[PDB]
């Protein structure tokens, strides 16, 4: 789900706009 | 398009592919005439 | 700082507009010599 993270849309950003939760920092 | 068109054509001697050809042929002939001078001595 | 970010971006734009057709390795060479400058100077800060 798009929670407010990511980009307004991936057009000019040249990336794939692929976002994934960070297993790193949780607790 | 500003500079000399001569640089973009093959026949002119001043550009570096042909000048090198002349260098090589002259160098070879220098080797040959050198060895043939040493033979006669 | 924002300024020198924009200076970098403007420089990349420089490499781009300057070379219409320089072939190839000239472009990669220029971009190398730019980026390496940016990192090597800014090293730590860029992360944040």
């Amino acid at each position: 789900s798009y929670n407010g993270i990511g980009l307004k849309s991936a057009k000019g950003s040249s990336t794939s706009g692929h976002v994934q939760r960070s297993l790193a920092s949780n607790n | 398009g500003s500079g000399d068109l001569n640089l973009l054509k093959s026949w002119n001697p001043k550009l570096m592919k042909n000048r090198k050809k002349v260098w090589e042929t002259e160098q070879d002939l220098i080797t040959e005439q050198q060895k043939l001078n040493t033979r006669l001595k | 700082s924002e300024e020198e970010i924009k200076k970098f971006d403007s420089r990349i734009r420089g490499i781009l507009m300057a070379s219409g057709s320089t072939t190839f390795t000239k472009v990669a060479a220029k971009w190398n010599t730019s980026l390496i400058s940016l990192f090597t100077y800014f090293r730590e800060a860029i992360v944040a």
Partner: protein
């Protein structure tokens, strides 16, 4: 050349004012490889 270089002082400000007296930028304006040596190396990156 160190014997000569000790008589070179003020190199930094000169480097920074090379902006004004000549067109082409010098992407590394913050070091002279003469006084500061060479502050980085890459070649490992190559193999990697």
């Amino acid at each position: 050349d160190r014997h000569t270089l000790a008589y070179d002082r003020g190199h930094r400000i000169r480097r920074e004012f090379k902006q004004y007296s000549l067109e082409r930028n010098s992407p590394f304006w913050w070091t002279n490889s003469h006084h500061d040596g060479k502050l980085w190396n890459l070649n490992a990156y190559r193999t990697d």
